[PDB]
Structures are given as C-alpha cells and as structure tokens.
Amino acid sequence: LRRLLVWTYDPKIRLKTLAALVDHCQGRKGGELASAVHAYTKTGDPYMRSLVQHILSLVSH
Amino acid sequence: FEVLEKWIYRGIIHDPYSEFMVEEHELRKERIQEDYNDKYWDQRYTIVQQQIPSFLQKMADKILSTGKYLNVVRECGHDVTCPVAKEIIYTLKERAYVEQIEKAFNYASKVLLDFLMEEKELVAHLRSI
C-alpha cells in the first residue's frame, strides 16, 4: 500500500503508547503504579486517551 | 471543552498542562491570612489574557466569576450540582456556547447569595456596625 504506510498509523501509536507505560514504570508496586498509569491518562488526542481509560479501570481492581 | 465542563459546574479545573483561560492561585497559606488577601476577586483569581481562545472573549470575565462563586460554597459541602450541567461542544454558525455559560453564570450567583444571606447572614453584622 506504498509498502503499508497507512498501517503504521493504526499501529505504531498504540505500540508507542504502550512503550511509554513500559518505559515510565521502574519497579513500582502499589499506589505509585496506579499513579503511573494515571501519568499518561491526561492526553489531548482521544485515541491514546481511550486506550488508557480502560487500562486504568483494569489495573485499579 | 472538558476543562470547561468541570470549571463551570464545580469550582475545579483539570488541565495537565495549563492552557485554560482561568488559572487558580493559592492564597490560603500559613503566612497569608484571611485578613491579608482581603477580597478574593482582586488577587486570588486572575484572568490570563493569551490563553483565551478569543471567541470566548464576550463571556470571558464572566467565566472567571462562575466557578469562583461556586468554590466558596464547595469548601463547606462539595455538592454544587446544577440542573444546567450539560456537555459543551464548540459550535461556529451558532451561539450555544454563549447560552450555557450565562445559564450557569446566573444560577451560580443565585446559589451563593441564597447560601450567604441565610448561613453567615449579612444583616446582623451590618446592624451591629
């Protein structure tokens, strides 16, 4: 598709968001870990906002 | 327009990076007294000029006062639920983002006056003056 350059804007933004939570965390346990999923929840784009609005609800059980 | 839906129906903002027109300041410290910040319209709440989108300018001043009345009621009890709470979406070709702001703006001052003239009444101290 000109070698799939539209299929790097549907991925490579999910994976880029999930490479930030996998970069920002460093040995966190407890309440400082639910402050690290919270660290990327306030974003302007609804796309990355809508991914972690679910991840927080999962992790805070 | 989600920081807008918080600040006007309550007295709080939530911007991770400060880009809203209203910004709150803290003047309730240990070394700042209640008789040193005297009235909180003149120092505590300012309006930041260039974070205004300039199509809210017609109501701009008023947007500061709305949540400012509501906040000094919230410090006793934080339920400042309004029947005018509604999702605000920017519309051009229409002025509906004028109607909702004034709708909350009158109700806010009505609630604060009804609270203030009944609890912590202004009749007794002025008679005593």
mmCIF file of C-alpha atoms in Angstrom:
data_model
loop_
_atom_site.group_PDB
_atom_site.id
_atom_site.type_symbol
_atom_site.label_atom_id
_atom_site.label_comp_id
_atom_site.label_asym_id
_atom_site.label_seq_id
_atom_site.Cartn_x
_atom_site.Cartn_y
_atom_site.Cartn_z
ATOM 1 C CA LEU A 1 0.000 0.000 0.000
ATOM 2 C CA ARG A 2 3.063 2.032 -0.908
ATOM 3 C CA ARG A 3 4.524 -0.594 1.465
ATOM 4 C CA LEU A 4 1.894 -0.239 4.211
ATOM 5 C CA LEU A 5 2.418 3.321 5.429
ATOM 6 C CA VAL A 6 -1.260 3.639 6.372
ATOM 7 C CA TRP A 7 -0.775 0.507 8.515
ATOM 8 C CA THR A 8 1.780 2.294 10.643
ATOM 9 C CA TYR A 9 -0.672 4.962 11.825
ATOM 10 C CA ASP A 10 -3.218 2.433 13.045
ATOM 11 C CA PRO A 11 -0.363 0.651 14.865
ATOM 12 C CA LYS A 12 2.841 2.481 15.969
ATOM 13 C CA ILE A 13 0.565 4.749 18.029
ATOM 14 C CA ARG A 14 -0.918 2.007 20.188
ATOM 15 C CA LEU A 15 2.556 0.466 20.450
ATOM 16 C CA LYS A 16 4.061 3.897 21.054
ATOM 17 C CA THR A 17 1.628 4.447 23.922
ATOM 18 C CA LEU A 18 2.344 1.002 25.362
ATOM 19 C CA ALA A 19 6.084 1.701 25.069
ATOM 20 C CA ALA A 20 5.640 4.738 27.363
ATOM 21 C CA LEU A 21 3.986 2.804 30.189
ATOM 22 C CA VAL A 22 6.732 0.197 29.662
ATOM 23 C CA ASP A 23 9.332 2.982 29.877
ATOM 24 C CA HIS A 24 7.980 5.157 32.706
ATOM 25 C CA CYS A 25 7.473 2.343 35.211
ATOM 26 C CA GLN A 26 10.526 1.125 37.113
ATOM 27 C CA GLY A 27 9.896 -1.402 39.889
ATOM 28 C CA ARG A 28 6.647 0.228 41.005
ATOM 29 C CA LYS A 29 4.217 -1.614 43.262
ATOM 30 C CA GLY A 30 1.046 -0.444 44.931
ATOM 31 C CA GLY A 31 -0.329 3.087 44.690
ATOM 32 C CA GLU A 32 2.656 4.570 42.846
ATOM 33 C CA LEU A 33 1.924 2.173 39.978
ATOM 34 C CA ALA A 34 -1.678 3.386 39.639
ATOM 35 C CA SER A 35 -0.142 6.849 39.591
ATOM 36 C CA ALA A 36 1.938 5.725 36.603
ATOM 37 C CA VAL A 37 -0.983 4.521 34.508
ATOM 38 C CA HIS A 38 -2.534 7.816 35.606
ATOM 39 C CA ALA A 39 0.610 9.576 34.356
ATOM 40 C CA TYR A 40 -0.432 9.101 30.713
ATOM 41 C CA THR A 41 -4.221 9.303 31.088
ATOM 42 C CA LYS A 42 -4.474 13.064 30.506
ATOM 43 C CA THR A 43 -3.723 13.410 26.788
ATOM 44 C CA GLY A 44 -5.354 15.644 24.190
ATOM 45 C CA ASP A 45 -5.911 13.001 21.434
ATOM 46 C CA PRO A 46 -8.990 10.834 22.190
ATOM 47 C CA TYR A 47 -7.187 7.862 20.601
ATOM 48 C CA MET A 48 -4.488 7.437 23.258
ATOM 49 C CA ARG A 49 -6.918 8.744 25.860
ATOM 50 C CA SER A 50 -9.398 5.973 25.051
ATOM 51 C CA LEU A 51 -6.818 3.213 25.360
ATOM 52 C CA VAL A 52 -5.680 4.017 28.904
ATOM 53 C CA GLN A 53 -9.165 4.955 30.149
ATOM 54 C CA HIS A 54 -9.630 1.164 30.043
ATOM 55 C CA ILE A 55 -6.180 0.158 31.307
ATOM 56 C CA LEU A 56 -6.705 2.220 34.477
ATOM 57 C CA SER A 57 -10.059 0.559 35.175
ATOM 58 C CA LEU A 58 -8.335 -2.800 34.789
ATOM 59 C CA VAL A 59 -5.293 -2.095 36.949
ATOM 60 C CA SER A 60 -7.155 -0.470 39.835
ATOM 61 C CA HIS A 61 -9.037 -3.615 40.865
ATOM 62 C CA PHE B 1 -14.063 21.744 26.428
ATOM 63 C CA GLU B 2 -13.724 19.099 29.139
ATOM 64 C CA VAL B 3 -11.895 21.504 31.443
ATOM 65 C CA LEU B 4 -14.779 23.838 30.608
ATOM 66 C CA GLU B 5 -17.318 21.201 31.706
ATOM 67 C CA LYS B 6 -15.583 20.929 35.098
ATOM 68 C CA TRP B 7 -14.784 24.553 35.955
ATOM 69 C CA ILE B 8 -18.245 25.983 35.404
ATOM 70 C CA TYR B 9 -20.431 23.332 37.083
ATOM 71 C CA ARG B 10 -17.984 22.915 40.012
ATOM 72 C CA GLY B 11 -15.068 25.024 41.203
ATOM 73 C CA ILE B 12 -12.141 22.921 39.995
ATOM 74 C CA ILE B 13 -10.067 22.665 36.827
ATOM 75 C CA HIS B 14 -8.175 19.713 35.422
ATOM 76 C CA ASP B 15 -5.586 20.607 32.779
ATOM 77 C CA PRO B 16 -2.350 18.528 32.812
ATOM 78 C CA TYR B 17 -0.642 21.444 31.073
ATOM 79 C CA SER B 18 -2.031 24.876 31.891
ATOM 80 C CA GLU B 19 -3.729 26.194 28.763
ATOM 81 C CA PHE B 20 -7.117 27.137 30.127
ATOM 82 C CA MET B 21 -8.063 30.803 30.409
ATOM 83 C CA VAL B 22 -8.789 30.615 34.144
ATOM 84 C CA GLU B 23 -5.974 29.672 36.486
ATOM 85 C CA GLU B 24 -6.450 29.362 40.228
ATOM 86 C CA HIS B 25 -3.911 30.693 42.680
ATOM 87 C CA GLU B 26 -3.361 29.647 46.270
ATOM 88 C CA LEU B 27 -3.558 32.393 48.879
ATOM 89 C CA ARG B 28 -4.579 30.318 51.912
ATOM 90 C CA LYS B 29 -1.059 29.663 53.278
ATOM 91 C CA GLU B 30 0.202 29.758 56.859
ATOM 92 C CA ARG B 31 1.761 33.222 56.390
ATOM 93 C CA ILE B 32 -1.121 34.556 54.254
ATOM 94 C CA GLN B 33 -4.152 35.292 56.434
ATOM 95 C CA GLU B 34 -7.831 35.771 55.760
ATOM 96 C CA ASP B 35 -7.329 39.500 56.514
ATOM 97 C CA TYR B 36 -4.256 39.776 54.240
ATOM 98 C CA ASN B 37 -5.655 38.532 50.897
ATOM 99 C CA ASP B 38 -8.604 40.632 51.696
ATOM 100 C CA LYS B 39 -11.174 40.105 48.934
ATOM 101 C CA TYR B 40 -10.517 37.219 46.597
ATOM 102 C CA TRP B 41 -11.696 38.929 43.392
ATOM 103 C CA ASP B 42 -8.736 41.322 43.398
ATOM 104 C CA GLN B 43 -5.769 38.937 43.871
ATOM 105 C CA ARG B 44 -6.658 35.252 44.118
ATOM 106 C CA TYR B 45 -8.327 34.752 40.745
ATOM 107 C CA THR B 46 -6.763 36.444 37.738
ATOM 108 C CA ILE B 47 -7.569 36.050 34.053
ATOM 109 C CA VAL B 48 -4.689 35.032 31.788
ATOM 110 C CA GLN B 49 -5.133 37.013 28.598
ATOM 111 C CA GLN B 50 -3.449 34.950 25.880
ATOM 112 C CA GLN B 51 -4.841 31.556 26.914
ATOM 113 C CA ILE B 52 -8.276 32.934 25.993
ATOM 114 C CA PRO B 53 -9.354 31.480 22.609
ATOM 115 C CA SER B 54 -10.822 34.995 21.808
ATOM 116 C CA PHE B 55 -14.217 33.625 20.754
ATOM 117 C CA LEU B 56 -14.978 33.159 24.454
ATOM 118 C CA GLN B 57 -13.968 36.799 24.983
ATOM 119 C CA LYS B 58 -17.568 38.077 25.058
ATOM 120 C CA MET B 59 -18.158 35.962 28.185
ATOM 121 C CA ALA B 60 -14.502 35.880 29.308
ATOM 122 C CA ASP B 61 -14.723 37.914 32.536
ATOM 123 C CA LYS B 62 -17.938 36.071 33.400
ATOM 124 C CA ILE B 63 -16.257 32.650 33.045
ATOM 125 C CA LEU B 64 -13.914 33.601 35.869
ATOM 126 C CA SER B 65 -16.753 34.530 38.218
ATOM 127 C CA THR B 66 -18.888 31.390 37.611
ATOM 128 C CA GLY B 67 -16.712 28.809 39.323
ATOM 129 C CA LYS B 68 -15.404 31.435 41.717
ATOM 130 C CA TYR B 69 -18.791 31.864 43.380
ATOM 131 C CA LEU B 70 -19.233 28.093 43.378
ATOM 132 C CA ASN B 71 -15.921 27.319 45.049
ATOM 133 C CA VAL B 72 -16.548 29.076 48.385
ATOM 134 C CA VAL B 73 -19.742 27.023 48.704
ATOM 135 C CA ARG B 74 -17.821 23.834 47.870
ATOM 136 C CA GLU B 75 -15.447 24.264 50.814
ATOM 137 C CA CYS B 76 -18.316 23.538 53.193
ATOM 138 C CA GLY B 77 -20.127 20.953 51.063
ATOM 139 C CA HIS B 78 -18.805 19.883 47.672
ATOM 140 C CA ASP B 79 -22.184 19.035 46.105
ATOM 141 C CA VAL B 80 -22.805 22.032 43.854
ATOM 142 C CA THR B 81 -24.934 20.041 41.384
ATOM 143 C CA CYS B 82 -26.818 22.244 38.918
ATOM 144 C CA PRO B 83 -29.695 21.351 36.563
ATOM 145 C CA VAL B 84 -27.838 23.286 33.836
ATOM 146 C CA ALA B 85 -24.928 20.820 33.675
ATOM 147 C CA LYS B 86 -24.513 19.694 30.068
ATOM 148 C CA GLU B 87 -21.777 18.689 27.643
ATOM 149 C CA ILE B 88 -20.317 21.754 25.931
ATOM 150 C CA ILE B 89 -19.252 21.473 22.306
ATOM 151 C CA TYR B 90 -17.813 24.336 20.274
ATOM 152 C CA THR B 91 -20.200 25.439 17.554
ATOM 153 C CA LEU B 92 -19.462 28.055 14.914
ATOM 154 C CA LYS B 93 -22.524 29.331 12.937
ATOM 155 C CA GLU B 94 -24.315 29.037 16.301
ATOM 156 C CA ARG B 95 -24.056 30.695 19.719
ATOM 157 C CA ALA B 96 -24.982 27.864 22.055
ATOM 158 C CA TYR B 97 -21.673 28.128 23.921
ATOM 159 C CA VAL B 98 -22.960 31.545 24.967
ATOM 160 C CA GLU B 99 -26.299 30.282 26.308
ATOM 161 C CA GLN B 100 -24.916 27.544 28.577
ATOM 162 C CA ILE B 101 -22.295 29.854 30.118
ATOM 163 C CA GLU B 102 -24.825 32.547 31.056
ATOM 164 C CA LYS B 103 -27.256 29.822 32.197
ATOM 165 C CA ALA B 104 -24.689 28.610 34.729
ATOM 166 C CA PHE B 105 -23.477 32.156 35.452
ATOM 167 C CA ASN B 106 -26.799 33.368 36.854
ATOM 168 C CA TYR B 107 -27.505 30.163 38.819
ATOM 169 C CA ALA B 108 -24.067 30.305 40.476
ATOM 170 C CA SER B 109 -24.600 33.752 41.992
ATOM 171 C CA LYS B 110 -28.189 32.863 42.940
ATOM 172 C CA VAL B 111 -26.957 29.814 44.879
ATOM 173 C CA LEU B 112 -24.141 31.752 46.590
ATOM 174 C CA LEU B 113 -26.485 34.589 47.612
ATOM 175 C CA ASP B 114 -29.124 32.167 48.941
ATOM 176 C CA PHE B 115 -26.384 30.385 50.897
ATOM 177 C CA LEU B 116 -24.768 33.605 52.139
ATOM 178 C CA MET B 117 -27.868 35.538 53.219
ATOM 179 C CA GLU B 118 -29.153 32.531 55.205
ATOM 180 C CA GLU B 119 -25.975 30.993 56.627
ATOM 181 C CA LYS B 120 -23.435 33.677 57.692
ATOM 182 C CA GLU B 121 -26.071 36.409 57.224
ATOM 183 C CA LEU B 122 -25.094 39.947 56.227
ATOM 184 C CA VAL B 123 -27.975 41.555 58.160
ATOM 185 C CA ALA B 124 -26.669 41.031 61.711
ATOM 186 C CA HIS B 125 -23.112 42.347 61.363
ATOM 187 C CA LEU B 126 -24.246 45.463 59.477
ATOM 188 C CA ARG B 127 -26.889 46.230 62.112
ATOM 189 C CA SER B 128 -24.126 45.833 64.708
ATOM 190 C CA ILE B 129 -21.869 48.209 62.713
#
